[PDB]
């Protein structure tokens, strides 16, 4: 309607399509159901939920006068969205750790076909996400805010009541420290170590081999650059929304809303906050070669 909803809809559609094809490949193509791949598909699920929980959340924030799903509606929606975001971040950092352990320490490969271990790890990650989301779920609620420009009230979600603004702030900070600082730092260090190891391997592997080793060298350099750009995209996508939420929590302006140009900014952040969800599948699509083959096959 405002020339921006179309871009958000297209992003959500492409992300849903990517994640759906990814899960369909993981299920149908059993050959790709190895030990680590579980984690990968887990992320997709999270992403799916996020996307499946992103359509309504925004659909009610824009092109609407006030909240629609009600009190329990906002409760469950915020709970599931925060759980999906936490699961996504945790699975991303776990995949980074696994790639680090496999590339930097290739001789320490764990036992294969141990699907039970990865399943228990994913279950623990999901449980930790749900536990860390329970606070906002129990404290979230729909409240009315006044608008002096309109001289009327409008209902909207709030992770905490206005009477405990400070509390909210603290939570927000914690969320940041738990969703941006430590995850970004660990992913960055792991990807840097992986890229350094890949470069040292490309330098160590025989380069004189006639058109047989240079191909692997180029592939290793390409995947190293991809891994290095992954963390950059993750940061550029999760910094805008984090700063937006920090501003909203530190301000917590009640009975008044600054309806300035800020609108575009926040929604822009949202788009970026979702771009990463679409980058994770395609990222993998860029890593391997036969992966693209069976992806286009199932697609």
């Amino acid at each position: 309607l405002c020339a921006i909803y179309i871009t958000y809809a297209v992003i959500i559609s492409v992300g849903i399509l990517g994640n759906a094809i990814l899960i369909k490949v993981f299920f149908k193509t059993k050959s790709m159901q190895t030990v680590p791949n579980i984690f990968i598909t887990s992320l997709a699920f999270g992403d799916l939920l996020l996307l499946l929980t992103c359509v309504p959340v925004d659909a009610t924030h824009y092109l609407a006068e006030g909240w629609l799903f009600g009190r329990i509606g906002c409760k469950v929606l915020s709970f599931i969205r925060l759980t999906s975001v936490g699961v996504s971040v945790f699975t991303l950092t776990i995949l980074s750790a696994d790639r680090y352990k496999a590339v930097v320490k290739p001789l320490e490969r764990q036992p294969s076909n141990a699907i039970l271990k990865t399943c228990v790890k994913a279950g623990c990650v999901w449980i930790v996400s749900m536990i860390f989301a329970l606070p906002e779920a129990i404290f979230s609620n729909v409240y009315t805010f006044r608008d002096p420009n309109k001289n009327m009230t409008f209902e909207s979600c709030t992770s905490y009541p206005v009477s405990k603004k400070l509390l909210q702030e603290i939570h927000s900070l914690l969320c940041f420290l738990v969703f941006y600082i430590i995850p970004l730092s660990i992913i960055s260090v792991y990807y840097s170590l992986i890229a350094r190891t890949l470069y040292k391997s490309t330098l160590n592997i025989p380069t004189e081999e006639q058109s047989h080793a240079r191909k692997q060298i180029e592939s290793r350099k390409r995947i190293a650059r991809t891994v290095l750009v992954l963390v950059a995209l993750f940061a550029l996508c999760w910094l805008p929304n984090h700063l937006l939420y920090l501003y909203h929590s530190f301000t917590s302006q009640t009975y008044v809303d600054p309806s300035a140009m800020h609108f575009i900014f926040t929604i822009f952040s949202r788009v970026l906050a979702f771009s990463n969800s679409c980058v994770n599948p395609f990222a993998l699509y860029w890593l391997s070669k036969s992966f693209q083959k069976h992806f286009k096959a199932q697609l």
Binding site: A64, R81, L82, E136, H248
Partner: peptide
């Protein structure tokens, strides 16, 4: 507004 003034994601 509900785009306005709160809530993560």
């Amino acid at each position: 507004x509900q785009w306005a003034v709160x809530h993560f994601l």
